[PDB]
Write a protein that binds this ligand. Structure first.
Ligand code: NAD
Ligand code: NAD
Ligand code: O66
Ligand code: O66
Lengths: 543, 543
């Protein structure tokens, strides 16, 4: 018998107070929007909201009975203690997925998870900050727009984007590409993944074959219209076929789950046969997945040699391809270094907010505060109309709205006032992905090729989490992805009170502040000037 | 021209308040007691108080001007930002030495430190919690006493302890062994190290040769008296010679710095020639250091085959010896699993406190509160007279006093009252090593062979640091030692105020609480009962 978790709607408390209730609803919202919610899996195949259902039930009970001056402590998805702290402390502290680095290799991480000692935490899966496919779509859209500005004269009309991966997060690629004007073709081996994008508005059409997809993409390109087409098939086989048939894409990227232990499908298997092979014969699953990934990466490089702009989109494809024997895949650029890093230098990152009421009018109210607040032509003034027009709510109504240093606390204080005075019906939860300037160390991705070589320095997310606790964030998390990266998340709730006014301002300005500091420290001049302008620095002699 | 840093004494503020002043004095005290203070090196050859002297000068300026509701942020020894937080937040957040695990190997850590991107933080070096050789001496003493209880009928009279390593931390072995009744022989390659122990009261006599050392040790053993003798020589050569000459030690351990990049001396070189070889030809320095370490480990194993109790004392000798080609060294037990783990199950760990005044009467006052507070026969009632009789103050007067869950906050509240009412002249700083139940993940040491296999799970120190911030610790740090371990430190200051009363109780009970939780989670029955008794648990079904 299925759980079918849904977040509570409306304005009735089941907990002792709105801070606790909002976090409960965020946890419930994660599972409501998850890719495999009956396994607690939220996205990327195995990133979970809780270690297991008994752990989930205990977390829920504790949120319903904890006081506003108590702090629940969660360890890799498992509630482990409830401490009396104080009103200005967080209500929940989480550390998920962290393993000392020498033993945090891929094989040992898989063993530890299989024995119940750890979970794959993702970024927003295990600390309850997921808002469905919307959470990533602004960054995927921004990446395509910036590609268009840098390499295609500022327009994707008539241009073709080819990608793979229509999962919980990759599912935003087809919509991102359509919004940016491109004829967008997404490959996924699982027809269920395409149907789920088709039903949530993220995909327009599912093709019946490669030939059919080719025809529909050429039509969109010839009309110079944005639209998206899905193909069912393995990226390795389909990318090869698309080259034989002369697709000639302008952009090629990929957002499959390429982890051979967790959801990469070898050529000729289904998702279920692959999961079963990992269970019964992992050495053969690994060999088969590497052979498919090698072809997959070679197909992208073949497009790159014909003239396509090929980049990695944050799924570790390059490093895993190099390990599977494609050394040239290590030479591919990344969306971060081509498009996102100059935004991080200004503290601009995937800020986001969730209506705890479940009422879409609460989001439309905040979209309205944004249009009265931010200058015309600002990034956010261009984005909110796109979101309004193209993005269907999933679970609790929520909005991705990238904003930068000082802008996040400005918006959150105006929302907190709007909660206090009745324009918004219930608290708003502010959070963000961990793909942000001051909250992640990740040499394969966010911090690849730092100007000063500090790629792997992970002091920075630890400081980000310690500041969030010290500033009164409602919920703070520290996550790792094996031995490859470390990140910090935090949630801060606008409940209309003055206490929340103080917290929203302290937390969010320090959250973007430490990111600006981090990039100024690396030597990025735009960050150094932002740091100086906002008084974020410390004067050190002998410079 | 040398800095010659000394902590300020007396009751005059140079900062805006006693929280800031106490932390300034702790930072100054670290360098005053450091093994190489003109290089900012505190102990283990390269663990530093600050990234460099310019960083140190900026930290000092900021401590003198920051307000009581501001938080200084330090990144691997470098001040990087000053944030407005609140009165109940920490005054200093530090993250030192952390590198994402895939790139945190020994060779890359050495490169990153050489380029100024990171520091070796030790545990108490980079977050200003060091009290000279006293910080480790209770744990070294406790280890010898427990060895005596388990293997020698409860007495070391007439017994011989052989060890190596008379550095800042290894220097406590000769005194620990003497206090426990043994004839204790310590080998060190550097006569300066022995002279410094001889001058601070940690070593009785320096031998002039192996033959001389042998004679003085046999005399102490025959009188059945405790005493210590130092030999100048390389452990590899001296341990071999001691076996040829038939020392027949009862206990053999080692506390050299065995890191070949940082202070392990190959056989036939001096400390200076070795440091120079690392600089000019590190591949040969590594080869020579491994050959010496192999012999060093084989000499210990030869004693073990004659019948000595041989254990590792926390310096990574086993793992580095296995890497140097001695696989049998991996089979040696460790002081943690033989002697310390049952203390961690009760939350008992290296708690410690420092008189900010610099006045020894403030320590004697707290020694007196302890003798009126703790039942006769309690561990601490046996230790304080030993400390009083054998331990010379270094720098600011300070006391190591291992205590367990609820005992630490009990003592700290009584001290805070004694500060409020004049028995103690100025604030007392409470802190601890990071070798503690809830504050370190370390498979080679503190968490080797956890009953449930969770050795490498490092969620726990991250939670320890997040709780310390949320509970108002004065100073919180997160440290790593390469890819091998992660730890959390915190300092909480008894300044006589009610605000400090609240903080001391919240911080310290959560600091020991999370350690008890951590061991109960692993299945240790004494910890599970402590967790139940103090209401630290969370009920989870399907158990
Ligand atoms: N770029 C970013 O900022 C960003 C954001 C979130 C997710 N990610 C990464 O994106 C990846 C995907 O995440 P997700 O949540 O969408 O994962 P998911 O598990 O929900 O979806 C992965 C999809 O890949 C498909 N797939 C697997 N092997 C395939 C193959 N050989 N050919 C074709 N399709 C194949 C599966 O059918 C599935 O639909 C992960 O690596 C995740 O870490 C990055
Ligand atoms: N067991 C514990 O709880 C504990 C506590 C603190 C320190 N430590 C560890 O103890 C070790 C020593 O720390 P420290 O602060 O004393 O270091 P240190 O650098 O101050 O002293 C190391 C000493 O080793 C000597 N030495 C080096 N190579 C030698 C050789 N081949 N033969 C003989 N002597 C040799 C040096 O002369 C030096 O005096 C480190 O690994 C540190 O991490 C463990
Ligand atoms: O942590 C990671 O590197 C992968 C998952 C994460 N990436 C983008 N968004 C997410 O939550
Ligand atoms: O962090 C480590 O493993 C070594 C240094 C540390 N050991 C004991 N005491 C200390 O401060």
């Amino acid at each position: 018998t299925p759980r079918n978790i849904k977040a509570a709607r409306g304005t009735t408390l089941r907990c002792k107070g709105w801070q606790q209730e909002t976090i409960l609803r965020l946890l419930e919202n994660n599972i409501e929007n998850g890719e495999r919610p009956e396994d607690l899996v939220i996205y990327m195949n195995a990133a979970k909201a809780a270690r297991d259902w008994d752990c989930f039930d205990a977390i829920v009970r504790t949120l319903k009975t904890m006081e506003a001056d108590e702090t629940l402590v969660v360890q890799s998805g498992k509630p482990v203690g409830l401490f009396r702290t104080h009103a200005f402390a967080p209500r929940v502290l989480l550390a998920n997925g962290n393993v000392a680095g020498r033993w945090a290799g891929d094989a040992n991480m898989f063993e530890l998870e299989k024995r119940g000692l750890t979970i794959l935490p993702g970024m927003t899966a295990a600390c309850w900050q997921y808002i469905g496919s919307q959470g990533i779509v602004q960054g995927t859209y921004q990446s395509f727009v910036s590609a268009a500005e840098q390499y295609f004269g500022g327009s994707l009309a008539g241009r073709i984007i080819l990608t793979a991966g229509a999962g919980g997060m990759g599912g935003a690629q087809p919509l991102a590409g359509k919004m940016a004007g491109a004829a967008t073709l997404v490959v996924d081996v699982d027809p269920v993944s395409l149907e789920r994008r088709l039903n949530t508005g993220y995909l327009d059409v599912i093709a019946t074959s490669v030939d059919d997809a080719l025809a529909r993409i050429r039509t969109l390109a010839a009309e110079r219209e944005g639209g998206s087409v899905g193909i069912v098939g393995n990226a390795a086989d389909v990318f090869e076929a698309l080259h034989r048939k002369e697709l000639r894409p302008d952009i090629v990227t990929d957002q499959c789950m390429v982890d051979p232990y967790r959801g990469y499908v070898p050529s000729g298997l289904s998702p279920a046969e692959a999961a079963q092979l990992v269970r019964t014969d992992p050495e053969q699953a690994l060999a088969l997945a590497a052979a498919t990934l090698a072809r997959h990466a070679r197909a992208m490089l073949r497009f790159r040699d014909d003239g396509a702009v090929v980049f990695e989109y944050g799924n570790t494809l390059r490093a895993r391809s190099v390990a599977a024997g494609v050394p040239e895949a290590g030479e591919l650029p990344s969306f971060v270094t081509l498009f996102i890093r100059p935004l991080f230098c200004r503290g601009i990152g995937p800020f986001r907010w969730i209506a705890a009421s479940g009422d879409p009018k609460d989001i439309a109210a905040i979209d309205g505060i944004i249009e009265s607040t931010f200058a015309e032509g600002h990034m956010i003034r261009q984005w909110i109309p796109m979101a309004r027009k193209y993005i269907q709510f999933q679970g609790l109504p929520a909005r991705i709205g990238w904003l930068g240093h000082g802008e996040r606390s400005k918006l959150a204080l105006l929302v907190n006032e709007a909660v206090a005075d009745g324009r918004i019906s219930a608290p708003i939860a502010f959070t963000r992905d961990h793909l942000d300037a001051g909250s992640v160390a990740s040499p394969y991705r966010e911090t690849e090729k730092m100007q000063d070589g500090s790629d792997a320095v992970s002091d920075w997310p630890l400081l980000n989490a310690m500041l969030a606790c010290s500033n009164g964030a409602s919920l703070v998390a520290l996550h790792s992805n094996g031995d490859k990266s470390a990140s910090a998340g935090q949630t801060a709730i606008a409940d209309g009170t003055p206490m929340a006014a103080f917290k929203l301002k302290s937390v969010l300005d320090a959250d973007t502040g430490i990111g600006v500091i981090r990039y100024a420290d690396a030597g990025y001049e735009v960050a150094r000037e932002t740091r100086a302008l906002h008084g974020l620095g410390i004067e050190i002699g002998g410079g």
